[PDB]
Design a protein around this ligand. Sequence first.
Ligand SMILES: O=C([O-])C(=O)/C=C/CC(=O)c1ccccc1
Ligand SMILES: O=C([O-])C(=O)/C=C/CC(=O)c1ccccc1
Ligand SMILES: O=C([O-])C(=O)/C=C/CC(=O)c1ccccc1
Ligand SMILES: O=C([O-])C(=O)/C=C/CC(=O)c1ccccc1
Lengths: 283, 283, 283, 283
Amino acid sequence: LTESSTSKFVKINEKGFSDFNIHYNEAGNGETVIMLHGGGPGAGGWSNYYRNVGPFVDAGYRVILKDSPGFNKSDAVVMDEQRGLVNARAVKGLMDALDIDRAHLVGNSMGGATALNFALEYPDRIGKLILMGPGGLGPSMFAPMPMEGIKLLFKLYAEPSYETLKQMLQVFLYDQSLITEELLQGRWEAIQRQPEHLKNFLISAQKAPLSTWDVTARLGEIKAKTFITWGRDDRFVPLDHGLKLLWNIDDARLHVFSKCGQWAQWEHADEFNRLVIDFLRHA
Amino acid sequence: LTESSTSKFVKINEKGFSDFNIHYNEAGNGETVIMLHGGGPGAGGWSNYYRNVGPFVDAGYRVILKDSPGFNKSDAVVMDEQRGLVNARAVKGLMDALDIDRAHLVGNSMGGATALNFALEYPDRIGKLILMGPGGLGPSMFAPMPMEGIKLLFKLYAEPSYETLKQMLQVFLYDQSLITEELLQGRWEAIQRQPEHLKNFLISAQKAPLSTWDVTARLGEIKAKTFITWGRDDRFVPLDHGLKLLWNIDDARLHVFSKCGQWAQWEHADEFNRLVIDFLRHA
Amino acid sequence: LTESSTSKFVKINEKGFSDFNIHYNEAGNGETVIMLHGGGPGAGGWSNYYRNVGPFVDAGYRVILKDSPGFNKSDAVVMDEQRGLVNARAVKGLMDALDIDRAHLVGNSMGGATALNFALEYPDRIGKLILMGPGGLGPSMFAPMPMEGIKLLFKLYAEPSYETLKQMLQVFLYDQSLITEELLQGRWEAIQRQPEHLKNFLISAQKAPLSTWDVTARLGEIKAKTFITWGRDDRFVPLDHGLKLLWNIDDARLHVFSKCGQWAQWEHADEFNRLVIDFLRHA
Amino acid sequence: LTESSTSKFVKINEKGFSDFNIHYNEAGNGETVIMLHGGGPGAGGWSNYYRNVGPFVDAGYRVILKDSPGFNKSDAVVMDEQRGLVNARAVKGLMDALDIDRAHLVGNSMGGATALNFALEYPDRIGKLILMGPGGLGPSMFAPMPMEGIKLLFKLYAEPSYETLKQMLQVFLYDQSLITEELLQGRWEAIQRQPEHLKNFLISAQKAPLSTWDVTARLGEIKAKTFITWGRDDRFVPLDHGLKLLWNIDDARLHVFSKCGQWAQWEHADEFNRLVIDFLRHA
Ligand SMILES: O=C([O-])C(=O)/C=C/CC(=O)c1ccccc1
Ligand SMILES: O=C([O-])C(=O)/C=C/CC(=O)c1ccccc1
Ligand SMILES: O=C([O-])C(=O)/C=C/CC(=O)c1ccccc1
Ligand SMILES: O=C([O-])C(=O)/C=C/CC(=O)c1ccccc1
């Protein structure tokens, strides 16, 4: 599987969206799993889930690696509402366009916020819910905020540079030997190719600050079986939010990976893939 | 499989132990997994792991459900050293007697302390390490101590009664509908059959208080791949000790079950069995 | 100062309350501090704040030890709304009746919930806010719920007895040598004198469960300078809620007493009195 | 009071120290309080405690603002042992030279480690112990390490620059409006005046990593009355270590300031001064 061979576009119409272009990468043909990426400059579906798409397809799923609005090859947008909800509407739009009745959702940081909002707004359209360090769930009981990683994320948005990108990636990853030239250059290319997404993200954040993403009060509404994952060493979203989700969602479990930042799906790909595939098959 | 059909005895000789009788229940014939029980009155290997022995044997393991010294059908003993270490010596004694070179260990509360001490003392004799709410790892950062469940455990030791047993089991289990007459009567029988174990446990606790069990300072020595499980609703051993283990053991991961007390292996048997079997096969 | 010499009654009219009798104990004549008690059977203003009223009066305050509705010598009531709000309305009613423009509030457990609701509903009528382990602020990130102490509180409500009262007091207090015959008999007398309050509390709890008390979402509205106290060893309200308040209230500080249960004002009276008096004078 | 008018030097001889020059600033003449500074480049006694020395002297104490070895105007040194212990020996040396029988200690970060080691090694020479976010107490249960601030501290040590100093100070302080030209230029001057301290600190850290500072196992030995302070928003030393100290020291209390980094004594000087003075007078 390659980015090019799996690349697709679909125009969506849902709520505020009118013929809005969504890019995604699709492989496989079984039960649908939509994987949703984080919010840093240059993020996208393929790069976030590169180590996961193959094994999930091998397991029998149809994997859709979705670019959220205002990221990668999806249309540019300035959002005046919290991103989780707007992104969730885009997932619904994509599902309607493709005739997908129910999807399992996997979401990391901003994508975990998206997945939470989707489960709240469209409970009849979600199967299982996999939450990898979801962002925007209010204050931490231990971590000063904004967290170290989020400061760097905003610095890169405002002053994009190759060196600051490298600094951000060093904070994202526990094992900094995963930062090869290929992956650094690749993310840099995503930033260079669409400078307007960076501007727009900052304008959006002014209109709808991170506090607006906090759906904590509604977590008791979630009926989907939920699998929460965290990196022990996550410097972007605080580990105690894994406990917040565990206490407030009805049917949840929490798995914490040691020696791991924001991307367990990268740093611990084999264990991540096995755990999540087992959850989807058997929970 | 039944308790009777799997029941075995072996005399051990290791350090202080001289022809000391150990009871265990054994089934299967593949790689050995020794499962180690908790410290409440009437605890034993069979009752603690009744929902687990079958699936593990089906998966290809040889399962040994060990009665620790001073519990169930093993010999009575008064211990003047911390129980984790003494119990670990007994595991070594059993392994030597049975010609088992290496075992995977699964240990709950007192059995998790045992398994930790075994990994520290005999690193060349352990495979993988599965720790289910291990006891005696020092103070909690949040939970007043002694914890609610441990108070009840000591009350039952001192004043054994059917009603206090029921009270203890109600605190052990999140879902109190698991407390059938069969299981209540069965544990009561274990207490009634060996009153001297209760006396002896209390004398032992005076000679070696719970603070003596704390091996926190040595956790960095553990080389075994480690899988830590906790119940979210454990009223016996504090949830933040799961984090303590995760931070201090080199290769660990933490899984927390919602709606679960001290016995995930009972309340969430199917998920527990799948996770642990997958860990043993693939981690 | 004695209970008898300070005892007063006032009829209140506020919202649902119509000529509702409120008992309180008053001493001193300077700036008003209203102290609000907990929710266990037999609770009341005098017994909760016996070690505090003298020093606060000596410092120049007028102290009002208020009996909340459905406790001690105040009128019996069945509440169908969360107790914090109903109690806060009663404080307002008392203040209006006595021509008190602004009061400092001190509140313990249920009284801390009361004080929070008062600050939210009547911001122009509160001075400073002192919160001693406020109850009902949602789930803990660490403590299974209902907490050990709250189970005992409900047991005593349902099956009042001298022995269960003693058990509850043993859990309330870190230092169990504070439980003299005088204080045990005194609380027992409060329970015996008004059995209907016990019945009514249980009916109220059915109509408005503890989750209904959770005002977490509104904490950002509080403008009052806030001093949060906790006992390290509190088995009734979880220590991490002290952190929740600290993160969510604008101008707060947190003081945690070691070797202390729910009643710092009893177990650490001198330090408590000095700290709170200094806060009222100088913060 | 000024730095110049209070400046003194004393040669010490204790253990490894032979005619080792210690700089300190002294004012007042009552009971002695020795205040011990943090470990960042350019740290020293005067700058760390500038807002505190006056009020403490006004309260009747003799204040000694000590420069630890390898900082500010004290002699340069490469340490091969953990800094807390070496620094504590220097405090003892200073006390012996000046005929001070007992001192109260106030210590921030590295100075809190110093104060802990002093209380452990020389219990008959300490009065009360005030610990402001002490450093080196092992892993956090929540914070990835090295913490954000400590990374910056090491960056400035290795690559000193005015801009990196400003970045470090922005992370130290919750309220960044406290960073005036005066204070920025002043700290820069301390760095410029003694470049060898920076080199030496880095060599020392190689010989004795932060894990070597962890005295957690010995905290139960401390008999001194202890007052632990933390900033809620401390990005250098993790807030859960305040709880670790509270659980493991016999007679401790914990005060957490909101909207506060590593330096409560700066950001909340008036409240800090009142609390600590009250503790010294009355606890
Ligand atoms: O959601 C995201 O942040 C996302 O696109 C994931 C990107 C992974 C990534 O850029 C990466 C870079 C270097 C090494 C490993 C991974
Ligand atoms: O180690 C132990 O505590 C142990 O022997 C486990 C016993 C399980 C148990 O007594 C039980 C009782 C009722 C329902 C489910 C389980
Ligand atoms: O709000 C309350 O729970 C309250 O009325 C306080 C009562 C204190 C109390 O009953 C007590 C009993 C024994 C020893 C010390 C104190
Ligand atoms: O121990 C230390 O880090 C110390 O010397 C304290 C210095 C305070 C400081 O540099 C500061 C700078 C700007 C604003 C306020 C304070």
